[PDB]
Curated annotation (Swiss-Prot), chains A, B:
Disulfide bond sites: 52-147
Cofactor: binding comment: Binds 1 copper ion per subunit.
Cofactor: Cu cation; Zn(2+)
Record-level GO cellular component terms: periplasmic space
InterPro entries: SOD-like_Cu/Zn_dom_sf, SOD_Cu/Zn_/chaperone, SOD_Cu/Zn_BS, SOD_Cu_Zn_dom
Protein name: Superoxide dismutase [Cu-Zn]
Gene that encodes it: sodC
């Protein structure tokens, strides 16, 4: 059970690499092979809808907005950690990008199964992720910068 | 079940902060509050011995060497991932340090229990951790830069 997800930069429209998804006894491991991202920690989540298209809100374009919100099959309406249950099941560990713009550090989501991920989107945000809705909603990820649909 | 581990810089001898250890249903979470570290990803492992003292090898001083090797209660003699079983149970996700020298990103070790950690050491290395003994032993962590004994 391994899936390859192609990731595209939402602003440039160009490919930025792939993430390999694998099932193990401890959860789903996301192994990135990405480039052209800003150095530092990036919010990283499964979103509800199988699209990376834009949406609009109050007359403003939202890149990657068609993916909807964080994947939340238990209707928690809360953003949190990958190892806490009363928040979005889509909440992954943050994605690290090296000084050279590459992301290669794999991370584990203990609460997810690979089977439930088909048809959802993987999102990488501009900001980081403090795994809280304070002081900024949704961990402070802010804008969506790269996205791919899980097939 | 929460423990506070005080971490000290091995070269300067000064405190660099603490790591809080907590047990949850998915494993042990390590929540760092550290400062004065080099930006980037750092190898991060539980080592066998409850000491942060030096050792010597072939006439050279090894800072933090008294902690011995990676914690390996199943005698795997292999370095690997936090979610693979045939390698050191002490292998943790890598520790991220921000541009400002702070480490605040918590990580999960699904294979560990809090009870088994007492009396061991937590180590932070100079280099990163590719979770392999190739191309460099022990994930390329190299020198030990900060350490604390788990009480
Ligand atoms: Cu997101
Ligand atoms: Cu180590
Ligand atoms: Zn969330
Ligand atoms: Zn190891």
């Amino acid at each position: 059970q391994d899936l390859t997800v192609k990731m595209t930069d939402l602003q440039t429209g160009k490919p930025v690499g792939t993430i390999e998804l694998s099932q193990n006894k401890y959860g789903v491991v996301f192994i990135p092979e990405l480039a052209d991202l800003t150095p530092g920690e990036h919010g990283f989540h499964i979103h509800q809808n199988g699209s990376c298209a834009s949406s609009e809100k109050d007359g403003k374009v939202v890149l990657g907005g068609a993916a909807g919100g964080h994947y939340d099959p238990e209707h928690t309406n809360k953003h949190g950690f990958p190892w806490t249950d009363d928040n979005h099941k889509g909440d992954l560990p943050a994605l690290f990008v090296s000084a050279n713009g590459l992301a290669t550090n794999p991370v584990l989501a203990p609460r997810l199964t690979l089977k439930e991920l088909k048809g959802h989107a993987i999102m990488i945000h501009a900001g980081g992720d403090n795994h809280s809705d304070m002081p900024k909603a949704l961990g402070g990820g802010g804008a969506r910068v790269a996205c791919g649909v899980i097939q």
